[PDB]
Write a protein that binds this ligand. Structure first.
Ligand SMILES: Nc1nc2c(ncn2[C@@H]2O[C@H](COP(=O)(O)OP(=O)(O)OP(=O)(O)O)[C@@H](O)[C@H]2O)c(=O)[nH]1
Ligand SMILES: [Mg+2]
Lengths: 111, 111, 74, 77, 852
RNA sequence: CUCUGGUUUCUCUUCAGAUCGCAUAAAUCUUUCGCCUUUUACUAAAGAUUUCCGUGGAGAGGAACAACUCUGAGUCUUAACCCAAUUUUUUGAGGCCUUGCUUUGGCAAGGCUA
């Protein structure tokens, strides 16, 4: 067996890559539930920045801490599904439309 | 349903390389010494601000240092001053530098 | 497997050897092999009469070794 | 390697009794037990076929020429 | 017994059977630097013997570090005992009493407490960091405490997954670590029979996280198991250490064929390990099935579905099995302790080995007098009652049996520091659960209930109506000195009793803690350092006393010395106006105080050897060398008391009559000190004259002792006095870049960098420096926060140094809240510590003189 | 050598203080101090409840294709060729006489042999 292959350093680097790039399986999250810059504003602010952006960093940290501190475990439900009930009803029907078409539709409906 | 996934290591490596521009290339949590949720909780509880950290309203009605009335304990004539006790020292060692540390969190030591 | 008997401790010590046939000899351990065949130096036959006779350096086949006893401290 | 052999090695450091093929009975501390049942013992009491006893400091008996061994009951569990 | 216990591979009945046979026991102490893997190693052993318990995939279980503070901080704070039945490579089973100790340099008292009752030491060394400060100090401590030391090189996976060194360079790194350890051992131990090398079996290689542990013997056993025609003993004898394999002749040689062949170790042990790890972490989806097929490992699809780290742990566990190399090492190179009892009694027992009880205990038989020795005190979760943890050196402890507990002050003449107690229950303490038993024989560790009341730190338990000639074991000698000092007060004075109870409880809990009440009614606590004191305060505020406490800012304890002989010879007279004494003071020579403290000399020595040493080494005339009377506050103190009074002027018989009183006065005076009432260090007190009253009721008692102390004070004050500061020795472990930052931070605080070197085979640097203890406060957090966490430092007390200023100067003016410049730090410290103690505002060199 | 257990998808019932969610909203009530004069804390903290956006597990029903990879189980090394002078399928430990002991029967010792 060869000591190393062409994808050995890659695996060793993946061992230390940050989450979720150190995994090889898992679940699917929501586009809302994935924040891209939380790690950016959890870090020390880069040196030589203006006061406004410095205070922006600090305030984002403040609200992040407040959420983390006030979080409470979710409660026990019975898993009732509004849209499933709607579909069960006779007043609604299923179909596939272009998202922009549906957006115009809902704009008109709200108007 | 698009619920769960299991990728291969070459796929993970390519995705990591592509996402590189959004990741800070940190291998340890030593970066976040006195800059993690526990340190922020302790600062909020003690009503103090880490230089780069957030700043909240006093959790408990703050004790006025001009109220205490010069006992033998707080006699300023016995103190030996070498370096001012910054907020960081109290955040790092809450129970040794503070009086009445309530709802204070111990911060993870070196890794 | 093909193990040695653990006899290094007994090397160059005086020993008392009980052999089959109710035979007994005494001498200094000079070596051994995996079959427990022994080399015994300055060997003496302890005849059933009580009389003892010097036979010199000898080979004892491990097959016919019942028991050995050290006459020294190991 | 046999199950009884493992249990024998377990008795190393304990007081055990050994009968040879010739019926001499040796009681004392088991120092070393080899895979082939070769037995090193110390501070022995030997009881011959005529009934007489003797005392020995150090002995070593070949496995083949052992009929059986009695081990402590400390092991049974 | 019969209480409920978790399922185990072995059985408690077999464990009870084993305890009786003191030949299959092993008392081991796991010690080493901070964060070097000891706790995870112990936990993996517990996992092996207890199938139900397990270490989480993402999080690491400890099964030590049970405390809430330990769990939150991530640093072991208290030593933890474990008792397991581990199987040996040969298939035999032994009983291991393993005391896992903390690593932080501040908690070395726990390590000393473990060593006192241990018989062997296992030193855990990280494979990347290598030798470090605490490893050096622990090697020194072990070889001085006369224990057998073996080594486990842990974290060997950092050479493969972090440094990714080539196999030959990894071998070189391991060899270098072994060489460093051997050098340290040879330095600190005269005997050369203790040499560490994997060939002998004194060194094991472990990766605790991924459950790897092996010795050359165990790996050769794996090879033999795969192919059954080799003696793994010979194979292991040949593997390590510059032995090149030759396959054409299938033989091992000291001469390398082809000038490119790898050593047998690199070829057989290291290289396949590299291969296994690389295949698991790089090719889990392409060739790992083939590699596992070759190795014979078969694992389920659900098992191979895991992530890389759990999969590595699983594959390595399947390949290696149990930690048999550790058991081999401990069994082969640690006393029985039937064998090791004799050195233990020789070193610890105060009555000497030659004593009849000395022999009876060196025998170490379960049937004999009871001579248990208790060194630890563990509190229940409720924090009400303490259980004494100790070892049984003779006899057998029985539940409900009345016993006699002797404290530290007990002596065969003053038999009042003893008390008759009634032991309630006994436990065989596994880390997180205690197996209750009804008796314990000699040669085992035991928890005892009902004997906590009459003991504070250490004690010895014997039987009443027997062992009348029983003497206590020596009190623990600690590896350092507790210097940092804080003052404590309740917030509401109505709750003082609760605070006092908490103070007593923490004093019991922490072996080297010293709590005291000053003259001004101030409750002071002495601790080793910042983290030590923080943990102590957390315990005092949350566990024991449930009240709120104000703490003063930390400060250190100083000493008092002289720099030149007394200006004039001084004297004093007893209130009876007889019994005049006359003394002079001077400074000792360099290093003599160190010799006295480190026991290079012993006042117990015969006067012949004492005078010989003093004459030959420190150029002392034999006349004076044979005139020694006392060695400072303790039997081993850094001050000496001699008498130069020639017999022509005074009666030697009368001086011998008053010798005890004069010595007591001298020791008390040295302990207190005139300047700020603190220890006097490095001073020679010479009695130049003494006129003694004839009648015993005219001399002795309350007449000479206060007069002797007053004369000592007068001589010290007449001699140019100075204060002495404590100095910590700091050792930072920083990246190759942050050395300049470390230099800056140290320079800011009167620090002085002795050295800064790289760590061979690692990308890091070690910077060794000296820092005043008083300025050390907050230094580590300053460094870490300025460097962004990449620099870490540990500090330990090193030595005493003279404070820059001159203390007995009244010209200086001190403002209340200003950092004074260097030249009058001495005066500032003196006056402020005087105020703290509550003494007069200042001292005059004629204060204790009789004339004014 | 054979017998279970499958995968996907839609829906219903119920439990979940597990980061049920590696993310994060709103409403009400209470206390606190704000600042108060009548109404009104976005720019403020604590506690409690509730509602919404989202999960797990288990059970039930439907409908689409795969049916022995794996999970185990029934079924526990089946045999081609060669072998035993320390631990059992090749073992030369074989006999007789005398004496003593023993109620006899029976047991111990020595010698003779080829
Ligand atoms: N890479 C690697 N890390 C390890 C290994 N073993 C332990 N560690 C890590 O080292 C750190 C120290 O863990 P512990 O062993 O529990 O600490 P300790 O040995 O008890 O030392 P103290 O905290 O002073 O008591 C942890 O963060 C572990 O994850 C190992 O084998 N390999
Ligand atoms: Mg630990």
């Amino acid at each position: 067996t060869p000591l190393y292959t062409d994808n050995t350093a890659n695996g060793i680097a993946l061992l230390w890559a940050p989450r979720p790039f150190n995994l090889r399986s898992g679940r699917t999250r929501r586009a809302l539930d994935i924040p891209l810059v939380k790690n950016w504003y959890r870090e020390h602010c880069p040196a030589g920045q203006p006061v406004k952006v410095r205070v922006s960093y600090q305030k984002l940290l403040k609200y992040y801490v407040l959420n983390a501190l006030k979080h409470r475990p979710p409660k026990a439900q019975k898993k009732r599904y509004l849209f499933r009930s709607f579909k069960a009803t006779k007043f609604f029907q299923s179909t596939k439309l272009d998202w922009v078409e549906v957006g115009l539709q809902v704009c008109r409906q709200g108007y | 349903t698009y619920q769960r996934w299991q990728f291969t290591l070459p796929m993970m490596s390519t995705l990591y390389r592509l996402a590189n521009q959004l990741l800070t290339d940190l291998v340890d949590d030593n970066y976040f010494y006195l800059f993690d949720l526990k340190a922020f909780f302790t600062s909020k509880a003690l009503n103090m601000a880490i230089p780069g950290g957030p700043k909240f309203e006093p959790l408990v009605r703050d004790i006025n240092l001009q109220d205490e009335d010069w006992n033998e304990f707080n006699d300023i004539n016995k103190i030996i001053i070498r370096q001012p006790i910054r907020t960081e020292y109290k955040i790092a060692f809450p129970y040794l530098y503070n009086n009445l540390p309530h709802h204070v969190h111990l911060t993870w030591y070196h890794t | 497997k093909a193990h040695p008997p653990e006899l290094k401790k007994f090397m160059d010590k005086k020993l008392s050897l009980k052999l089959n046939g109710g035979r007994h000899v005494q001498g200094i351990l000079r070596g051994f092999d995996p079959f427990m065949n022994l080399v015994i130096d300055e060997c003496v036959e302890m005849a059933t009469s009580g009389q003892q006779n010097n036979i010199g350096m000898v080979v004892i086949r491990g097959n016919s070794i019942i028991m050995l006893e050290a006459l020294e401290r190991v | 390697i046999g199950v009884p052999i493992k249990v024998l090695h377990e008795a190393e450091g304990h007081i055990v009794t050994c009968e040879t093929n010739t019926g001499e009975v040796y009681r004392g501390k088991l120092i070393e037990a080899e895979d082939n049942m070769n037995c090193q013992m110390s501070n022995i009491t030997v009881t011959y076929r005529d009934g007489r006893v003797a005392q020995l400091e150090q002995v070593y008996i070949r496995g083949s020429k052992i009929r059986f061994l009695i081990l402590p009951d400390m092991l049974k569990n | 017994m019969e209480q409920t216990l978790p399922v185990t591979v072995y059985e408690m009945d077999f464990l009870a059977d084993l305890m009786d046979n003191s030949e299959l026991i092993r008392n081991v102490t796991l010690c080493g630097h901070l964060h070097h893997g000891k706790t995870c190693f112990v936990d993996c052993l517990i996992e092996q013997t207890h199938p139900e318990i397990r270490k989480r995939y993402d999080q690491d279980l400890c099964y030590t570090d049970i405390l809430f503070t330990e769990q939150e901080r991530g640093v072991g704070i208290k030593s933890t005992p474990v008792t397991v039945v581990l199987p040996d490579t040969k298939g035999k089973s032994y009983l291991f009493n393993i005391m896992d100790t903390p690593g932080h340099v501040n908690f070395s008292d726990e390590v000393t407490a473990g060593l006192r009752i241990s018989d062997g030491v296992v030193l855990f060394i990280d494979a990347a960091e290598g030798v470090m400060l605490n490893t050096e100090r622990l090697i020194k401590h072990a070889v001085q405490e006369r224990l057998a030391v073996t080594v486990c090189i842990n974290k060997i996976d950092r050479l493969i997954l972090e440094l990714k060194l080539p196999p030959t360079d990894a071998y070189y790194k391991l060899r270098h670590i072994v060489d460093e350890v051997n050098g340290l051992i040879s330095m600190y131990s005269t005997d050369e029979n203790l040499i560490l090398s994997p060939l002998l079996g004194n060194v094991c290689f472990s990766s605790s996280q991924y459950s790897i542990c092996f010795t050359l013997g165990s790996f050769a056993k794996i090879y033999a198991d795969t192919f059954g025609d080799i003696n793994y003993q010979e194979f292991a004898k040949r593997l390590w250490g510059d032995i090149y394999f030759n396959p054409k002749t299938r033989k091992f040689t000291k001469k390398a064929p082809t000038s490119s062949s790898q050593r047998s170790f690199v070829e057989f042990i290291l290289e396949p390990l590299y291969k296994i790890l690389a295949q698991v972490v790089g090719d889990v989806d392409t060739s790992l099935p083939r590699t596992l097929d070759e190795l014979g490992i078969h694992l389920t699809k659900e098992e191979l579905k895991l992530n890389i780290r759990p999969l590595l742990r699983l594959v390595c566990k399947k390949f290696f099995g149990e930690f048999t190399g550790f058991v081999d090492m401990c069994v082969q190179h640690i006393p029985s302790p039937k064998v090791g009892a004799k050195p233990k009694i020789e070193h610890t027992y105060t009555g000497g080995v030659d004593s009849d009880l000395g022999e009876a205990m060196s025998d170490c038989d379960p049937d004999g007098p009871l001579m248990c020795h208790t060194t630890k005190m563990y509190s229940t979760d409720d924090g009400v009652q303490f259980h004494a943890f100790g070892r049984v050196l003779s006899g057998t402890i029985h539940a409900g049996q009345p016993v006699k507990v002797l404290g530290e002050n007990y002596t065969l003449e003053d038999e009042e520091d003893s008390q008759i107690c009634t032991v309630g229950r006994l436990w065989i303490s596994v880390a997180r659960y205690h197996i209750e038993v009804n008796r314990v024989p000699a040669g085992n560790w035991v928890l005892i209930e009902g004997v906590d009341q009459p003991i504070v730190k250490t004690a010895t338990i014997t039987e009443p109506r027997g062992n009348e000639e029983a003497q206590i074991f020596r009190p623990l000698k600690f590896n350092t000195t507790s210097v940092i000092k804080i003052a404590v007060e309740p917030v509401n004075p109505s709750e003082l009793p609760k605070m006092l109870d908490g103070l007593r409880k923490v004093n019991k809990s922490y072996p080297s803690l010293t709590t005291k009440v000053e003259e001004s009614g101030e409750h002071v606590i002495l601790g080793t350092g910042e983290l030590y004191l923080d943990c102590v305060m957390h315990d005092l505020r949350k566990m024991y006393s449930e009240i709120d406490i104000k703490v003063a800012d930390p400060v250190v304890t100083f000493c008092e010395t002289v720099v030149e002989t007394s200006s004039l010879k001084c004297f004093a007279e007893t209130p009876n106006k007889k019994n005049k004494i006359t003394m002079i003071a001077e400074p000792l020579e360099k290093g003599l105080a160190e010799d006295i403290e480190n026991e290079v000399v012993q006042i117990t020595w015969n006067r012949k050897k004492l005078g010989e040493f003093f004459q030959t080494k420190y150029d002392w005339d034999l006349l004076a060398a044979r005139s020694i009377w006392a060695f400072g506050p303790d039997a081993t103190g850094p001050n000496i008391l001699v008498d130069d009074t020639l017999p022509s002027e005074v009666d030697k018989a009368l001086l011998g009559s008053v010798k005890d009183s004069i010595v007591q006065g001298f020791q008390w005076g040295t302990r207190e000190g005139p300047l700020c009432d603190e220890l006097i260090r490095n001073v020679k007190f010479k009695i130049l004259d003494a006129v003694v009253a004839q009648e015993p009721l005219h001399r002795g008692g309350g007449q000479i002792i206060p007069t002797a102390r007053r004369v000592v004070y007068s001589a010290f004050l007449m001699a140019t006095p100075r204060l002495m500061e404590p100095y910590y020795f700091v050792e930072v472990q920083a990246p190759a870049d942050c050395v300049s930052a470390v230099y800056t931070v140290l320079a800011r605080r009167r620090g002085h960098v002795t050295q800064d070197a790289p760590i061979p085979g690692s990308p890091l640097y070690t910077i060794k420096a000296f820092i005043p203890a008083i300025d050390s406060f907050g230094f580590e957090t300053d460094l870490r926060t300025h460097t962004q966490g990449q620099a870490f430092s540990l500090s330990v007390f090193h030595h005493w140094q003279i404070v820059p200023g001159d203390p007995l100067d009244k010209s200086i003016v001190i403002r209340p809240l200003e950092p004074q410049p260097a030249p009058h730090l001495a005066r500032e410290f003196m006056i402020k510590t005087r105020r703290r103690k509550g003494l007069s505002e200042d001292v005059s060199i004629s204060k204790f003189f009789d004339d004014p």
